[model samples]
Target: AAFVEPSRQFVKDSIRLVKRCTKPDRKEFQKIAMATAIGFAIMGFIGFFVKLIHIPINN
Candidate 1:
């Protein structure tokens, strides 16, 4: 059937993709964590500044 062929190919490709992947090592994980933390901090800083600006205008 049309649906069966596509579904079979999708499962085969997904298995191949999974087999090609590997877990990150300690150094790679640390770099990822550092980038994520910096991004989070930057967003928090932006939100804080927006709140600070809004208070002055609303009062």
Candidate 2:
């Protein structure tokens, strides 16, 4: 019974630490947004190339 309470408290504290660590600043937000945009652009380019090649899929 004593061990269970301490384990639960430890889990709660770990969650709080994670939340604090991952809170983003404005610069971080801008960087993430730019990265996301670039990722989408790359995906679009790959999709276009696939369409051009007329790649086949089998069932």
Candidate 3:
């Protein structure tokens, strides 16, 4: 009974979560994409600069 009770509750909770969730619209998706791209570019620039600064040590 102990093993079965938690599994049954978890299944019910997952179903509730799925029912409450919604998908993003086209405009929302584009905004998300733009934000993601900008974050990626900033991270890339940070890593690139770090590598650029360490150039002499690798020589």
Candidate 4:
């Protein structure tokens, strides 16, 4: 459909850019992946303590 073509083209272009950016050294890719995973892991790790932390003190 004509309505979908523009979005499809944008997706295709973004995919091309991802491929280009990810085409570098394998070591760099590994570092990027590890950093991303650890960042997410830390976020989840902190989230688990959300309820354990309270700001308002009850008098």
- At residue 30, give the lDDT of candidate 2: 97
Write down the TM-score for model 4.
0.42
Q: Lowest summed lDDT over 10 consecutive residues: which window, candidate 1?
A: 1-10
Q: List all candidate RMSDs to the true structure.
A: 2.6, 4.1, 2.8, 5.7
The residue-level lDDT of candidate 3 at 57 comes to 75
The C-alpha lDDT values of all candidates are 0.88, 0.83, 0.88, 0.78
**Which regions of candidate 3 fall more than 4 Å away from where they truly are?**
1-3
Order of candidate numbers by TM-score, starting with the best: 1, 3, 2, 4
| Clash totals in order | 0, 0, 0, 0
Off by over 4 Å in 1: 1-3
Tell me the tens digit of each residue's lDDT in model 2 across 1-59. 36678688999999999987867889899999989988998988897788777556531
Error of 1 at 13 (Å): 1.3
The residue-by-residue lDDT of candidate 3 on 14-41, one tens digit each, is 9999888997889899999989988998
Q: What TM-score would every model get versus the actual structure?
A: 0.67, 0.51, 0.65, 0.42
Candidate 1 residue-wise lDDT, 1-59, digit = tens: 36678688999899999889997989899999989988998988897798799897988
